[PDB]
Amino acid sequence: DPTVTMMQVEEKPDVTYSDVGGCKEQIEKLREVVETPLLHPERFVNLGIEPPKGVLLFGPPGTGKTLCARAVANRTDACFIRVIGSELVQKYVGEGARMVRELFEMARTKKACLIFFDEIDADNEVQRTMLELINQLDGFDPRGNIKVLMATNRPDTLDPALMRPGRLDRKIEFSLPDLEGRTHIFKIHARSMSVERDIRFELLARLCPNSTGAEIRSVCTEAGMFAIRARRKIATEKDFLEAVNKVIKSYAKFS
Amino acid sequence: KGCLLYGPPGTGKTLLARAVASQLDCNFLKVVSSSIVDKYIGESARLIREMFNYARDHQPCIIFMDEIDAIGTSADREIQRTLMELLNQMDGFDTLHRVKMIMATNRPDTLDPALLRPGRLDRKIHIDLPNEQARLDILKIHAGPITKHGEIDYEAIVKLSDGFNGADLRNVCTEAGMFAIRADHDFVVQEDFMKAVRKVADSKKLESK
Amino acid sequence: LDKQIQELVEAIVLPMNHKEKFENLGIQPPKGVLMYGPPGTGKTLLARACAAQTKATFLKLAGPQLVQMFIGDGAKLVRDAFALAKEKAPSIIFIDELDAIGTKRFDSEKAGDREVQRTMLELLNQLDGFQPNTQVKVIAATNRVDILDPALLRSGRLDRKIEFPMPNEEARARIMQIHSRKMNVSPDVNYEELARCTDDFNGAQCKAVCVEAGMIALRRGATELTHEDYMEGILEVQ
Incomplete structure (x- = not known):
C-alpha cells in the first residue's frame, strides 16, 4: 500500500461551519450540493431529473484550505475520499490512470464514495491525465452523482472554454475578506490553546483591515x-502585539 | 501525366473526377489539397520526392487533385516551390508512363495563371x-x-x-x-x-459553393 | 426522443433490414445526416440522449478526441473507428461542431483547422473513395452556418441536411416536453413566458435552467415543479 492510499483517507475532523462569514452566498451554493443531495436523496429523485452535480472555486486563495475543511467537518459521519493535485504531476507517468481507477474502485467498495480533487493547479503526460480524467469523472462508469468540485488557486485553462458547457456549471468565486468576517475564524481559533477570554475578538479583528484567511492564519x-x-504560560496580545502588527504590516507591504 | 478540365460556367468538376473514378479507376492513390499546410518552416521538397518516390515504387497511381482554388507576401512562394518540384517531377528522367494526375478547381479566376503556363498543365479544355x-x-x-x-x-x-x-x-x-x-x-x-x-x-x- | 425518431430509427435500421428491397429495387440508402441550424435545440445532449434510445452500440467521439498533440494520429483514430465500427459490431458515432473545423482560408501558412481538414477530408477520402458504405455511417452536426464546407455534397457524405430553425414556442415546447416528458410537471405550466425567455440558450444551458428550477423547489415547499420556477431559473443564471 503506497503512501497516497494510506494518506488519501481523511480523518481528524478539521475546521467546522462556525467560520460562516463574508462570502455566505457561494458557500451556501456549494454547501447545498455536498450536504443536501446526500442527506435528502428521495425528494431529489422524485423532484425531477437529477440533483446538482457541483460548482467551481477559482480565483484568489483568500481563506483556502478552510472551506474544504468545512466540507469535511460538516460531513454526515460518512467520510469521503479526497485527492491532492500534487499526485497528478509526478515522475514515472502512466500510474495516474491506475490511481484514478483504483480510487474509483475504492469508491465502489465504499458504496459510491465521494471523490474530491484538491489543488488542480499542480505535454502528452498531462493531456492523458486531463483527457482520461474527463473520461473518468464525466464518464458514467464509476458514478455520475457522487461529487465534482475543483477548489484551487489557478484554473489552468486548457480546455474549459469548450468543456465547461455541460455537466459542470455554476461559475463562481472562492471567497473574499470582510471586516466582520474574521471574528468567526478567531472564534474557531479559540478551539486552539487556551487564550485568555478577556481579550475581545473584535478588538483583534478590527485592527487588521482587509486580511484574508491566510494572513490571519499567519x-x-x-x-x-x-x-x-x-517561553510563557498563557497567550496575551500584550506580549506578541509586535508579532501581530509586524505580521500584518510586514506582510501587508507586499501582500 | 496531367490534364486540365476547367469550366468557366458552373462548378463540380470534382464530381467529374468522381464520374471517371466511378466509371473506371482501377488505381487507388488519392492526394487531398489539405496536405500542403506548411505550418512549419517549409520542407515540401522531401514530401514531393518521398510521396512521388512511393508513386515510382507503386505501379497503381492515379491522382485526383481537388479544391485547389483556396490554396492558390509569401503565399505564392510556396506555390512556386511545389511547382518547381512538379517541374522536377515531370521534367527530369522520371517514369512518365506510370504517373497520372488530374487537377480540379471551382472558379475561373483562380485558375492559377502560374499553372496555366505549359509544361505544368499541358491539356486544357474549357467546358462550356x-x-x-x-x-x-x-x-x-x-x-x-x-x-x-x-x-x-x-x-x-x-x-x-x-x-x-x-x-x-x-x-x-x-x-x-x-x-x-x-x-x-x-x-x-x-x-x-x-x-x-x-x-x-x-x-x-x-x-x- | 419524440420529434426525431423516423429519420433516425429508419435511417439506421433500413441498411440492414430492408436489404431485400435494396436487391429488389437497386437503391442505396442515405448515409449522412446533418442536424444543423441556430443554437437552442441542444443537438448534443438530445442527440446523445437518442443514441441510447436507438438501443444499438454507441461510441463517443468528440472534438478534442481526434485532435491530438502529435501528428499522424488522426488517421490512426479514423482507421480505429473503422476497426471497431467497420470491423466490430455496428456502433453509433455522433460528432459535433463541424463548422468550426471547416474553415478554408486563402493563406496556407498557419492553420491547424486545415490539418483537421486533412484528417476530416481523409475520412471523406475513405467514404467517397470506398464505395461499400452500407456499414456504419458517419453522423455530423453544426451549431452555425457561417462557414459551411462545400465538399459535403454526396450520398455517403452529409446529404440529408435537416434544417432546425430557432426554437420557437412550438419547437421549444417540443424539445422541452421531451426534456420534461417524464418528470413531475404540474398542470399549470403554460410554457409561454418561460419558453419565450429562452433566448441564446443551448439545450445544455436549458438543462441547467431545469436544474436551477430543481434547486429552490425544496425551499418552495411544493414537491412538484411550478411554472414560475423555469423563468426564475432563467433570471437566476442570467
Missing part, C-alpha cells in the same frame, strides 16, 4: 511560534 | 457545354437497374438538370429512386420525380 500561526518562543 | 450527348449516354446506360414508371422521357430530365455532370444527373435519378423507396412503391407518379429534380437539383445549385 497571525495565529506566527503568534503561536513567537508565543512558544517567549 | 457539359456534354449533353455524353450525359444522355450516361443516363441511357445508367438507367437500367432503376425501375420507374412506363411513361418516362430522358431528354426532359437531361434538360432540367445540367451544368454539373451526367453522373450528378445519375445522382438525381437515383435520388428519385431513393424517394420512391421511401414511398414503398416501384412505379409512382412523376410529380415526386419532378420534386426530386427541382428540389434536389436546385438544392445542389444553391449549396454548390
Whole structure:
C-alpha cells in the first residue's frame, strides 16, 4: 500500500461551519450540493431529473484550505475520499490512470464514495491525465452523482472554454475578506490553546483591515511560534502585539 | 501525366473526377489539397520526392487533385516551390508512363495563371457545354437497374438538370429512386420525380459553393 | 426522443433490414445526416440522449478526441473507428461542431483547422473513395452556418441536411416536453413566458435552467415543479 492510499483517507475532523462569514452566498451554493443531495436523496429523485452535480472555486486563495475543511467537518459521519493535485504531476507517468481507477474502485467498495480533487493547479503526460480524467469523472462508469468540485488557486485553462458547457456549471468565486468576517475564524481559533477570554475578538479583528484567511492564519500561526518562543504560560496580545502588527504590516507591504 | 478540365460556367468538376473514378479507376492513390499546410518552416521538397518516390515504387497511381482554388507576401512562394518540384517531377528522367494526375478547381479566376503556363498543365479544355450527348449516354446506360414508371422521357430530365455532370444527373435519378423507396412503391407518379429534380437539383445549385 | 425518431430509427435500421428491397429495387440508402441550424435545440445532449434510445452500440467521439498533440494520429483514430465500427459490431458515432473545423482560408501558412481538414477530408477520402458504405455511417452536426464546407455534397457524405430553425414556442415546447416528458410537471405550466425567455440558450444551458428550477423547489415547499420556477431559473443564471 503506497503512501497516497494510506494518506488519501481523511480523518481528524478539521475546521467546522462556525467560520460562516463574508462570502455566505457561494458557500451556501456549494454547501447545498455536498450536504443536501446526500442527506435528502428521495425528494431529489422524485423532484425531477437529477440533483446538482457541483460548482467551481477559482480565483484568489483568500481563506483556502478552510472551506474544504468545512466540507469535511460538516460531513454526515460518512467520510469521503479526497485527492491532492500534487499526485497528478509526478515522475514515472502512466500510474495516474491506475490511481484514478483504483480510487474509483475504492469508491465502489465504499458504496459510491465521494471523490474530491484538491489543488488542480499542480505535454502528452498531462493531456492523458486531463483527457482520461474527463473520461473518468464525466464518464458514467464509476458514478455520475457522487461529487465534482475543483477548489484551487489557478484554473489552468486548457480546455474549459469548450468543456465547461455541460455537466459542470455554476461559475463562481472562492471567497473574499470582510471586516466582520474574521471574528468567526478567531472564534474557531479559540478551539486552539487556551487564550485568555478577556481579550475581545473584535478588538483583534478590527485592527487588521482587509486580511484574508491566510494572513490571519499567519497571525495565529506566527503568534503561536513567537508565543512558544517567549517561553510563557498563557497567550496575551500584550506580549506578541509586535508579532501581530509586524505580521500584518510586514506582510501587508507586499501582500 | 496531367490534364486540365476547367469550366468557366458552373462548378463540380470534382464530381467529374468522381464520374471517371466511378466509371473506371482501377488505381487507388488519392492526394487531398489539405496536405500542403506548411505550418512549419517549409520542407515540401522531401514530401514531393518521398510521396512521388512511393508513386515510382507503386505501379497503381492515379491522382485526383481537388479544391485547389483556396490554396492558390509569401503565399505564392510556396506555390512556386511545389511547382518547381512538379517541374522536377515531370521534367527530369522520371517514369512518365506510370504517373497520372488530374487537377480540379471551382472558379475561373483562380485558375492559377502560374499553372496555366505549359509544361505544368499541358491539356486544357474549357467546358462550356457539359456534354449533353455524353450525359444522355450516361443516363441511357445508367438507367437500367432503376425501375420507374412506363411513361418516362430522358431528354426532359437531361434538360432540367445540367451544368454539373451526367453522373450528378445519375445522382438525381437515383435520388428519385431513393424517394420512391421511401414511398414503398416501384412505379409512382412523376410529380415526386419532378420534386426530386427541382428540389434536389436546385438544392445542389444553391449549396454548390 | 419524440420529434426525431423516423429519420433516425429508419435511417439506421433500413441498411440492414430492408436489404431485400435494396436487391429488389437497386437503391442505396442515405448515409449522412446533418442536424444543423441556430443554437437552442441542444443537438448534443438530445442527440446523445437518442443514441441510447436507438438501443444499438454507441461510441463517443468528440472534438478534442481526434485532435491530438502529435501528428499522424488522426488517421490512426479514423482507421480505429473503422476497426471497431467497420470491423466490430455496428456502433453509433455522433460528432459535433463541424463548422468550426471547416474553415478554408486563402493563406496556407498557419492553420491547424486545415490539418483537421486533412484528417476530416481523409475520412471523406475513405467514404467517397470506398464505395461499400452500407456499414456504419458517419453522423455530423453544426451549431452555425457561417462557414459551411462545400465538399459535403454526396450520398455517403452529409446529404440529408435537416434544417432546425430557432426554437420557437412550438419547437421549444417540443424539445422541452421531451426534456420534461417524464418528470413531475404540474398542470399549470403554460410554457409561454418561460419558453419565450429562452433566448441564446443551448439545450445544455436549458438543462441547467431545469436544474436551477430543481434547486429552490425544496425551499418552495411544493414537491412538484411550478411554472414560475423555469423563468426564475432563467433570471437566476442570467
